[PDB]
Amino acid sequence: GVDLGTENLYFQSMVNPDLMPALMAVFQHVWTRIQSELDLDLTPPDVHVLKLIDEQRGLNLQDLGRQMCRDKALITRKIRELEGRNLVRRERNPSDQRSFQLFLTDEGLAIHQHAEAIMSRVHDELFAPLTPVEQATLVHLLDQCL
Amino acid sequence: VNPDLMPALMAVFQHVWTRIQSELDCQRLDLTPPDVHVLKLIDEQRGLNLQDLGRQMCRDKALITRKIRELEGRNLVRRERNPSDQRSFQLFLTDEGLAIHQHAEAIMSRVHDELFAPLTPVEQATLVHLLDQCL
């Protein structure tokens, strides 16, 4: 028959079937605007990598991997592509014998700041039709999912 | 607009993407969350063309063709010329593509249920309603 790996053929899902399509439709509205106003093929994980490097000055490949829940080999490949596009740079860590730390270049920081500005602008427009009470309910519900 | 809204929604998008990607990695499905969705759209809309896939994925012709050629290279998807319009391709899953789609669908069924399990059915309906008001 059909191989489902470690999945159960009788698994019963109870999630509201409109939840994942509603969140993906919101994601598409946000991502389309980011892609259009940036204009280089940055993917949503690329944008998150830049954010983590900017917010955690000098973090290493192991800590980035752990935060992205991706294996060290996959995240190093991603960093080498971003290095190639002059968005990220590796610097020798002084507190070690031979290890490296990640930093954004001037171009990498500029892309991160611009994308963040687009996100801020697009979210303001998208959720303006919600009343302050509905916005607080939305925050509370999104926070419960972590 | 509530200043905690954009960070909360972006943390949820990032948490959902990360969880799906980890679950696919854990069972060695060499797929990303948009690939899973591409396979689903091809399976549910038999013989859909590349233009209609592009529109549904919100991707220009160049990016969606690249994605389909990578899946074709992995023998998951088949491109067939539309007999009524030889300039256009119709997309189908191969036997291997269908098998990977069915496995990915059983993972997503469990993963989607686990991701929103912290919300009660009433809270999930409220979340849908609030997201829908923004279209």
Side-chain angles (χ1 to χ4, degrees), chain A residues 70 72-105 107-117:
Chain A
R70 288 278 263 177
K72 204 201 177 170
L74 301 164
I75 197 75
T76 306
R77 289 172 64 91
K78 178 69 75 191
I79 287 304
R80 295 197 68 198
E81 292 169 356
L82 293 170
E83 270 186 328
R85 298 310 299 267
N86 311 305
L87 299 178
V88 172
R89 58 173 163 90
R90 277 183 282 184
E91 286 288 309
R92 242 196 87 193
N93 180 12
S95 59
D96 274 49
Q97 59 311 311
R98 193 165 194 88
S99 75
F100 291 89
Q101 300 179 277
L102 308 168
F103 303 90
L104 295 184
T105 58
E107 307 91 278
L109 175 63
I111 294 305
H112 162 64
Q113 289 171 328
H114 189 185
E116 213 148 69

Side-chain angles (χ1 to χ4, degrees), chain A residues 124-135:
Chain A
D124 287 354
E125 294 178 1
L126 189 58
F127 296 110
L130 299 181
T131 66
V133 165
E134 289 166 334
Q135 289 178 19

Side-chain angles (χ1 to χ4, degrees), chain B residues 5-21:
Chain B
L5 193 40
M6 190 236 92
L9 186 61
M10 287 318 279
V12 165
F13 289 148
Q14 171 61 194
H15 169 64
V16 167
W17 185 297
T18 296
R19 180 73 64 83
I20 291 167
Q21 185 61 84

